[PDB]
Amino acid sequence: MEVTAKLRGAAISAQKARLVADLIRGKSVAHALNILNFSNKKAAVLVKKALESAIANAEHNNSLDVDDLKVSTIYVDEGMSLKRIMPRAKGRADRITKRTCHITVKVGV
Amino acid sequence: MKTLSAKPAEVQHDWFVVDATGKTLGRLATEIARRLRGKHKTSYTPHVDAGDYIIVINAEQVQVTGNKALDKKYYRHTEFPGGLKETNFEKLVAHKPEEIFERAVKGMLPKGPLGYAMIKKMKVYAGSEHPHAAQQPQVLDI
Amino acid sequence: ARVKRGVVAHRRHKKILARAKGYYGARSRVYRVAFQAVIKAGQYAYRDRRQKKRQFRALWIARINAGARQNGLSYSRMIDGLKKAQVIIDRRVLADIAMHDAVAFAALAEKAKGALA
Amino acid sequence: TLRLNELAPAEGAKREHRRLGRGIGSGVGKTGGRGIKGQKSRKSGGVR
Amino acid sequence: AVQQNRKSRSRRDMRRSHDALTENALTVDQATGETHRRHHVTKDGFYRGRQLFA
Amino acid sequence: MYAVIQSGGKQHRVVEGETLKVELLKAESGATITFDDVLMVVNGDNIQIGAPVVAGAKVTAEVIGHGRHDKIRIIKMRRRKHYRKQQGHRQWFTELKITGISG
RNA sequence: GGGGAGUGAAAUAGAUCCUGAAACCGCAUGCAUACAAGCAGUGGGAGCACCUUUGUGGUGUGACUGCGUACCUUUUGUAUA
RNA sequence: CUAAAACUAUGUGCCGAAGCUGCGGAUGUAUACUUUGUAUACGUGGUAGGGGAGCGUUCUGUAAGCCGAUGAAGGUGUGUU
Ligand SMILES: [Mg+2]
Ligand SMILES: [Mg+2]
Ligand SMILES: [Mg+2]
Ligand SMILES: [Mg+2]
Ligand SMILES: [Mg+2]
Ligand SMILES: [Mg+2]
Ligand SMILES: [Mg+2]
Ligand SMILES: [Mg+2]
Ligand SMILES: [Mg+2]
Ligand SMILES: [Mg+2]
Ligand SMILES: [Mg+2]
Ligand SMILES: [Mg+2]
Ligand SMILES: [Mg+2]
Ligand SMILES: [Mg+2]
Ligand SMILES: [Mg+2]
Ligand SMILES: [Mg+2]
Ligand SMILES: [Mg+2]
Ligand SMILES: [Mg+2]
């Protein structure tokens, strides 16, 4: 039985969050929390928020002990982009996308 | 009834040893290529290697006719701007007869993975002795 | 009577893209590329219905040649002798016999030999 | 046999109007009977 | 200056095949049971049985 | 014990109990058909090669029934010439079951 | 932001809210893939996996192998660089 | 590749195309003949272009009918003609 947490609308592109998601896939939640605590990645903070949320969900809503929970599934999807204008030289204009992402974490016994 | 392919798991490779002393190079290489490809069997399949192993002994005693010992040129290119290199039949047969047999036979074989697998089964030795007595090759007199 | 071409066009594109399952990359996802891939697969299959008969006949002939050379003949003389002996077995059956039954093929080679004499 | 469901025109009375530029299979496709690249292939292409 | 063909998704992933991150070197400190980065001070100010800012 | 028979411009090596597809026949789905132009009968050291037909050999089969093969798409396309043509095809076969080989 | 609880016929009807396609981007499973040269298919074809069956069955994959230079337009003529 | 795997001459076989034949199926024209179904024959590569026959989409009548919450349209699979 997997317990899920969804961090929707995190202000970071999926390509960057996926590097952190790949680091903790299929690991103990203690090991994953250690890995996320000592990373200098901005995505580590958001993935830690989502993962500790999933652990809290498993304990409160499902009565599962944390000592054997495992990161049984994690993936990062794209979210709604923000479209902005950036002026360029000579009157040209470029379109900037501010990319967001949705993190899904599922912990399992 | 449909036509059956030889299964690679039931292909039985056999070992043969042929003596190259005093034989025409190309006229021996055609028979070697036919044996290596498996063209002499009724289970012959163009996408399967069902050929035999062929040991060539006394490879440095193979013969060419006419004036080819001096006129037959072997070329290489090192892929460097002026790197086309040339050797003789008689220089290369006194230095690397195995390269002579491999060049003669590889040109009479298919060019691809199966062809490389087929060329792996030709074992060429310049002397009278080979190390495959454990395989007990039979004397194929061509 | 304004006609919206949404359901029918979608249906046609879905048909073409279903005939493209297994192709690499855009060739299985993108309709413009998938449609050319599918038309070309069709032309290839038309041409290869013809090429298959040549290929299988050449296979039978190689196998008969091997079997006939195991019996002191060659494909040419064995076919000539079997045609001089009124035998009308075709090459597919002869190749099947050569591959699966060596004694019957030796018997056929004996017929061809006796006719060539 | 006298219903609004069972009334037909005579055979040969109606023909389908010809529609150009509707694909290869119709036989009047790409150019629609006009040929290639002349004054007569343009819009309003006849000479007086 | 610019590509002549769009790069396929497969070659793009093959380029990113070297982009993975590594974990850090972590050790469990014995004087506090804490987990810290190896050869680093803890966030409580401990390192190898020595205290900063008591 | 196998025999070579002729059916539909094609030759078939059959053994007893074999179920094989041949070109469409007119015999109905319960009829038993007979091949008397057997070309060769092999039984094991007993090989009869007909020249052209084995004298008295006979092979009896049972018409299991008729069907069609799976659909073939025929596509013709001349590039740059505005010509495309598509056709479907399913070939009729009769499925026979070999009951007996005399030889 | 989410997980429960609750409302509701329905909550992947939860407000970016009917339906929710494609391109495009993830994750999981099966098979293939690190000695091999090209319009990426096609004809054949071993092996493996899963379903089923006592199948000459089905579904996925596809080692190896023959053949094979996209489409459109315009042209005497285009793989056309 | 050298008493050839060259050349000249001669012969006996064989390979070889979507050509021809075999088997099965479709179709155009014509002729017979039921009087519209079968035979028989000849035909069935095609651009521009000419001719013939159809599919599907929205809307009107038929329709105050018929199907539909025991689930329409739409979407996504599968099987089949
Ligand atoms: Mg036309
Ligand atoms: Mg034009
Ligand atoms: Mg002009
Ligand atoms: Mg004109
Ligand atoms: Mg991927
Ligand atoms: Mg829903
Ligand atoms: Mg919705
Ligand atoms: Mg390999
Ligand atoms: Mg020009
Ligand atoms: Mg020009
Ligand atoms: Mg060309
Ligand atoms: Mg171009
Ligand atoms: Mg180019
Ligand atoms: Mg042919
Ligand atoms: Mg023809
Ligand atoms: Mg016919
Ligand atoms: Mg014709
Ligand atoms: Mg025509």
Description:
- This is part of a larger assembly, with chains A (109 residues), B (142 residues), C (117 residues), D (48 residues), E (54 residues) and F (103 residues).
- With 109 residues, chain A is an alpha+beta fold.
- In chain A, 38% of the residues lie in helices and 35% in strands.
- Chain A has one domain (1-109).
- Chain A contains three helices and five strands, in the order E-H-H-H-E-E-E-E.
- In chain A, the strands form two sheets. A three-stranded antiparallel beta sheet of chain A has the order 1-5-2. A two-stranded antiparallel ribbon of chain A has the order 3-4.
- In chain A, strand 3 and strand 4 form a beta hairpin.
- In chain A, helix 1 crosses helix 3 and helix 2 (29-37) packs antiparallel against helix 3.
- Chain D is largely without helices or strands and 48 residues long.
- Chain E is mostly loops and 54 residues long.
- Helix content of chain E is 15%, strand content 11%.
- A two-stranded antiparallel ribbon of chain E has the order 1-2.
- The longest helix of chain E has 8 residues, at 9-16.
- The chains are: A alpha+beta (109), B alpha/beta (142), C mainly alpha (117), D little secondary structure (48), E little secondary structure (54), F mainly beta (103).
- Chains D and F meet through loops of D and loops of F.
- Residues 35, 38, 40-41 of chain D line the site of one magnesium ion.
- Chain C binds two RNA strands through residues 1-8, 10, 13-14, 17, 22-25, 27, 29-33, 35-37, 39-52, 54-56, 58, 61, 74-77, 79-81.
Main sheet makeup of chain D: none
Counted beta strands of chain A = 5
Terminal CA distance of chain A reads: 7 Å
Roughly how much helix do the residues of chain A carry, as a percent range? 25-40%
- The neighbouring-strand order within the major sheet of chain A is 1-5-2
Instruction: Write down the Rg of chain D.
Output: 18 Å
Q: Give the helix level of chain D as a range of percent.
A: under 10%
- Classify the beta-strand content of chain A into a percent band: 25-35%
Count of DSSP-assigned helices of chain D: 0
- Distinct bound molecules: magnesium ion
Strand content of chain D: under 5%
Q: Which chain pair has the greatest contact? A: C-F, 22 and 21 residues
Q: Rg of chain A, please?
A: 17 Å
For the secondary structure, the number of strands of chain D is 0
The major pleated sheet of chain A works out as:
3 strands, antiparallel
Secondary-structure element series of chain A: EHHHEEEE
Note the topology.
The structure is cut from a larger assembly and holds chains A (109 residues), B (142 residues), C (117 residues), D (48 residues), E (54 residues) and F (103 residues).
Chain A: E1 2-10, H1 14-24, H2 29-37, H3 42-62, E2 70-78, E3 82-87, E4 93-98, E5 101-108
Antiparallel strand pairs in A: 1-5, 2-5, 3-4
Chain B: E1 15-19, H1 25-37, E2 53-57, H2 68-71, E3 73-77, E4 84-88, H3 89-93, H4 97-106, H5 113-119, E5 122-124, E6 138-139
Parallel strand pairs in B: 1-2, 1-6, 2-5
Antiparallel strand pairs in B: 3-4
Chain F: E1 2-6, E2 11-15, E3 19-23, E4 32-35, E5 40-42, E6 47-49, E7 59-68, E8 72-78, E9 83-89, E10 92-101
Antiparallel strand pairs in F: 1-2, 1-5, 3-10, 4-7, 5-6, 7-10, 8-9
Chain C binds two RNA strands through residues 1-8, 10, 13-14, 17, 22-25, 27, 29-33, 35-37, 39-52, 54-56, 58, 61, 74-77, 79-81.
PDB class: ribosome
Keywords: antibiotic, tigecycline, translation, ribosome
Entry title: Acinetobacter baumannii ribosome-tigecycline complex - 50S subunit
